[PDB]
Amino acid sequence: KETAAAKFERQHMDSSTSAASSSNYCNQMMKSRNLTKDRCKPVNTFVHESLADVQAVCSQKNVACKNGQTNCYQSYSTMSITDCRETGSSKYPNCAYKTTQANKHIIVACEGNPYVPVHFDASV
């Protein structure tokens, strides 16, 4: 089955674009990354950085995750991100999202050897 690291990349990385280019970014990306296949994922963040720069966050500032786990890390620098969250009209299978651009630090949980992101915790 898909590894947690691979699911992080599929759900949260977009190294192919530097920012969201339109209000339809989330609608398109949530669909294309299969985040709307079974149900409308309510919230999701995409990170417009290289994969190595995001993986490097696992050696940056340790902080406890929202759920209390101690394997979270905050990026030292801000990153280009897109926040996706359902619109009021979103209704499966026609999942619909508001796209919001931002430049924020990210917090990710890390596991493994190599020690890499497995969960996106927050933009801050």
Side-chain angles (χ1 to χ4, degrees):
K1 53 223 104 169
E2 187 182 31
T3 72
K7 175 182 93 84
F8 175 94
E9 294 191 43
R10 178 175 57 83
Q11 297 193 138
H12 300 294
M13 289 297 308
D14 188 7
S15 309
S16 85
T17 66
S18 310
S21 65
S22 78
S23 61
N24 272 313
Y25 176 91
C26 293
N27 288 335
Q28 289 179 32
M29 287 291 287
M30 294 296 286
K31 178 172 169 61
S32 291
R33 296 295 182 81
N34 302 139
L35 311 181
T36 65
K37 185 180 166 271
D38 301 331
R39 64 185 174 81
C40 305
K41 189 173 191 291
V43 175
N44 194 70
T45 300
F46 291 98
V47 183
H48 302 274
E49 300 293 346
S50 71
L51 181 58
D53 281 351
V54 175
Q55 294 165 327
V57 176
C58 298
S59 63
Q60 298 178 17
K61 183 66 176 160
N62 179 248
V63 62
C65 308
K66 286 168 173 174
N67 79 342
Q69 288 180 22
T70 59
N71 65 139
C72 282
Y73 299 86
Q74 189 206 280
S75 63
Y76 291 134
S77 309
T78 65
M79 294 185 176
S80 173
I81 68 170
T82 299
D83 179 272
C84 299
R85 57 187 65 222
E86 283 185 284
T87 72
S89 291
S90 184
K91 192 200 164 163
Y92 185 88
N94 299 118
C95 302
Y97 294 89
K98 179 182 196 182
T99 295
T100 307
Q101 299 171 325
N103 285 279
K104 292 289 188 186
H105 303 265
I106 68 169
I107 301 179
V108 298
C110 303
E111 301 176 4
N113 188 340
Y115 194 59
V116 293
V118 296
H119 159 80
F120 191 92
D121 207 52
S123 53
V124 304

